[PDB]
């Protein structure tokens, strides 16, 4: 009981700070993943041995996609885990322990496609789950693997914390369907300004839940200028690819997928930030007040994109 996990000084406190980046090192991401649930959930909530033994697989069932890969996991649980740290108190102990989880296996066994290509392609995947469909493949990986022998992470919750678990693991998965996102945001602006959002309505802590694991995976736009520019590198390297088998079915791509229209990237990186990443982190202020700094991180990403546009870079 008394291994803690140490980090180096610079990242001891820089991982604290939302825009903090995991670095180069993919042999230290699983320690700074364990140092995260120990801080943020205590060193008793798993086994070591089954905690350690569930992230190298999770890790194996993450592909080697330019983006949707182990960095953007860990990335996005490093994410769930500064938003828990700066509101310690509005939190369950089951919710800390399924959300970091979740965060970590929210992108399970991606192949670098969105929900639309699977069903245009007709993949069998498209056919079992017709709404949600990576989101909900993600989910069943997590279960499979949570059922590995000496991978159960929650065996020593009693029966009815294990269904609450999973059923906020199984929520909070869902939620990073950015489909969903737009009505989940508009019902919480509606009930933040009629002052109806209760946060002990369970359904109410769903819809901030969801907000969060959003605001999670769109973190590569809350990071220093750096990082946000490199990260849309992966990103549009995977728009990209996505376009192409888009031309191979004779379809015409969106614009942001195809890489004839690379031009077009900082005017519609301006789009995504106006239309979906600053109206999430407005919302997700205004709901959790000590996440501002993902706000105004977004904001000064926002004025950066616009010096793109302006010549200025
Ligand atoms: O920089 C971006 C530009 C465009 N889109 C995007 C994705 C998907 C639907 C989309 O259209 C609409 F917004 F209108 F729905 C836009 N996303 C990002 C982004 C930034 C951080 N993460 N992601 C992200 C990446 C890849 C991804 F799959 C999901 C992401 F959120
Ligand atoms: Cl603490
Ligand atoms: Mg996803
Ligand atoms: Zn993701």
Redesign the pocket.
């Known amino acids: 009981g008394l291994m803690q996990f140490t980090l180096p000084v610079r990242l001891c406190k820089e991982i604290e700070l939302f825009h903090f980046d995991i670095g180069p090192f993919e042999n230290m991401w699983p320690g700074i993943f364990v140092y995260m649930v120990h801080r943020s959930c205590g060193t008793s909530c798993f086994e070591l041995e089954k905690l350690c033994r569930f992230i190298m697989s999770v890790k194996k069932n993450y592909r080697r996609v330019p983006?949707?890969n182990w960095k953007h996991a860990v990335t996005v649980a490093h994410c769930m885990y500064a938003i828990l740290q700066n509101n310690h108190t509005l939190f369950t102990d089951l919710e800390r322990k399924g959300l970091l989880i979740a965060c970590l296996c929210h992108d399970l066994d991606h192949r670098g496609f969105?929900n639309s290509y699977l069903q245009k392609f007709d993949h069998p995947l498209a056919a079992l789950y017709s709404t949600s469909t990576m989101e909900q493949h993600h989910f069943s990986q997590t279960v499979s693997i949570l059922q590995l022998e000496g991978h159960n992470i929650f065996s020593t919750l009693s029966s009815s914390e294990y269904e609450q678990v999973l059923e906020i693991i199984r929520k909070a998965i869902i939620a990073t369907d950015?489909?969903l996102?737009?009505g989940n945001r508009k019902q919480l602006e509606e009930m933040y300004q009629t002052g109806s959002l209760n946060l002990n309505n369970q359904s109410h802590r769903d819809r901030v839940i969801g907000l969060m694991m959003?605001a999670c995976?769109?973190?590569?736009?809350t990071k220093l200028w750096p990082v946000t520019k490199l990260?849309?590198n992966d990103?549009?390297a995977?728009?990209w690819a996505e376009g192409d088998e888009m031309k191979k079915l004779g379809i015409q791509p969106?614009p942001?997928m195809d890489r004839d229209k690379k031009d077009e990237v900082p005017q519609?990186?301006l789009?995504?930030?106006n239309?979906?990443?600053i109206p999430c982190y407005t919302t997700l202020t205004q709901i959790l007040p000590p996440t501002e700094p993902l706000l105004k991180a977004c904001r000064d990403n926002l004025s950066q994109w616009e010096k793109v546009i302006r010549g200025e870079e």
Do not use: K, N, R
């Open positions: 983006y949707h969105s950015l489909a996102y737009f959003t995976d769109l973190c590569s736009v990260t849309a990103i549009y995977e728009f969106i942001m519609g990186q789009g995504f930030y239309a979906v990443a």
